[PDB]
Amino acid sequence: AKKTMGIHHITAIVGHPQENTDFYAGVLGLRLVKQTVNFDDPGTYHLYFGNEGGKPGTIITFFPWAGARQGVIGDGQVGVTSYVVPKGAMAFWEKRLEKFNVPYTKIERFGEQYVEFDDPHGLHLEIVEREEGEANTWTFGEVTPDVAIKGFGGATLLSEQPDKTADLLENIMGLERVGKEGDFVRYRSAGDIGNVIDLKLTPIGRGQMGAGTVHHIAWRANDDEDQLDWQRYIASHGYGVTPVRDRNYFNAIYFREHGEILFEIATDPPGFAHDETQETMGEKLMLPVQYEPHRTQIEQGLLPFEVREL
Ligand SMILES: [Zn+2]
């Protein structure tokens, strides 16, 4: 079958863009690498945060719509998004969360210690220390390369049918089974980031779509050719798959897996530096060219916000 390097990006519906940004840039120190709009709804932001380069495996993306049409975290969703930091950096993050009045808990699984906390709109996050994965050199506030979030450590999936999700991850998608512990089976992809995928083995009841939930998880393809191969393979192995959609910073295909999680395969190229320079990406509102004749309509409707140090 096929083999993905790991997570490309994760996409979530959240609340006010300023609140979202104050958390992901202000607290977590991630770079806003692209501000654009939702391809489907031009009157809604689509914000992309990541490491200094917005590299695949570091990219968290948001549809911020203020007013919180709140969903419920449950089966058929990514339950927890995992962020990896350098070895020894746990205390930096614990003290920083405390400074910002963000409660956290400490849990252990598979011999690793995790800091668990929620973002302002209810998404479940965690931080884990690992040597693997390139340092994030985006300096923002007190966040420096020796402590900065390097990207995703992985994610924890809540599946309506965990046996089917496991079969997909291991036997179709080429992830290696690490083992089982507690209520989890763990899988590892071959990349050095976005690579540790935990699957909860007992269903906790179906989630509800809406704000404060993860919308989908995207897995990496090396290039357009690899993605086309994925489309052919996935469609012939028991799933519905969309046509390729050009999202400007990558091409995308989507398929809902049997545990009801929405998966995506996204190409590593071209990335976020091809309609803005690497040094300025994230600074201007970029639009799908189809909407450039409505820039006035579009901007008039978007809430202002700024990336700011807290
Ligand atoms: Zn996506």
From Swiss-Prot:
GO terms for cellular component: cytoplasm. Fe cation binds at H9, H216, E264. Residues 6-130, 151-268 form the VOC domain. Pfam families: Glyoxalase (PF00903). It is found in: Cytoplasm. Its main location: cytoplasm. Its cofactor is Fe(2+). Putative ring-cleavage dioxygenase that may contribute to the degradation of aromatic compounds. This is Putative ring-cleaving dioxygenase MhqO. It comes from Bacillus subtilis (strain 168).
